[PDB]
């Protein structure tokens, strides 16, 4: 699924995105953007051999399991493919769990270099939410 901007707001806010940890909701769509475009299908392959999926590019290397990043973790417990669905709950449990383990947002790349000390709130403007 390709999400609007809107409608993924209100998605992530609905699972509790907004403020998590202190990332306003924002940030949490522009880390989309940048990272998947708002597609839940997205998938990208790491120099390392993971790969990276879902709306939030979360990696296989550390936080999901498909079953060919060898040595990995699978830390949100999940199968990588789950992180593909159109139904975005397990990315964001997933993105909870990466985003209270200390490194903050910080864990998407898209969102530090693209989102971080810009004005996130611009993602979430006209938004009904
Ligand atoms: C939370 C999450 O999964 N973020 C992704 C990053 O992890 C990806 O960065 C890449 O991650 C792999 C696995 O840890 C690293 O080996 C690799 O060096 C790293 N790549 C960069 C440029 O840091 C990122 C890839 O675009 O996608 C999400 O942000
Ligand atoms: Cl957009
Ligand atoms: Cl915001
Ligand atoms: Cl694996
Ligand atoms: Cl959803
Ligand atoms: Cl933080
Ligand atoms: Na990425
Ligand atoms: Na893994």
Redesign the pocket.
Same mark, same amino acid.
């Given at each position: 699924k390709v999400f609007g901007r809107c409608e993924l707001a209100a998605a992530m806010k609905r699972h509790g995105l907004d403020n998590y940890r202190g990332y306003s909701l924002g940030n949490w769509v522009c880390?989309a953007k940048f990272?998947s475009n708002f597609n839940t299908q997205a998938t990208?392959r790491?120099?390392?051999g993971?790969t990276?999926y879902g709306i939030?590019?979360?990696?296989?290397? &550390?936080?999901c399991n498909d079953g060919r990043t060898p040595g990995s973790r699978n830390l949100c417990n999940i199968p990588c493919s789950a992180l593909l669905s159109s139904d975005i709950t397990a990315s964001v449990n997933c993105?909870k769990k990466?985003v209270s383990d200390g490194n903050g947002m910080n864990?998407?790349?898209? &969102?530090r270099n693209r989102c971080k000390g810009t004005d996130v709130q611009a993602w979430i403007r006209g938004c009904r939410l």
């Open positions: 880390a990272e990208n790491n120099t390392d993971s990276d939030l590019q979360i990696n296989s290397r &550390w936080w993105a990466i864990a998407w790349v898209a &969102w």
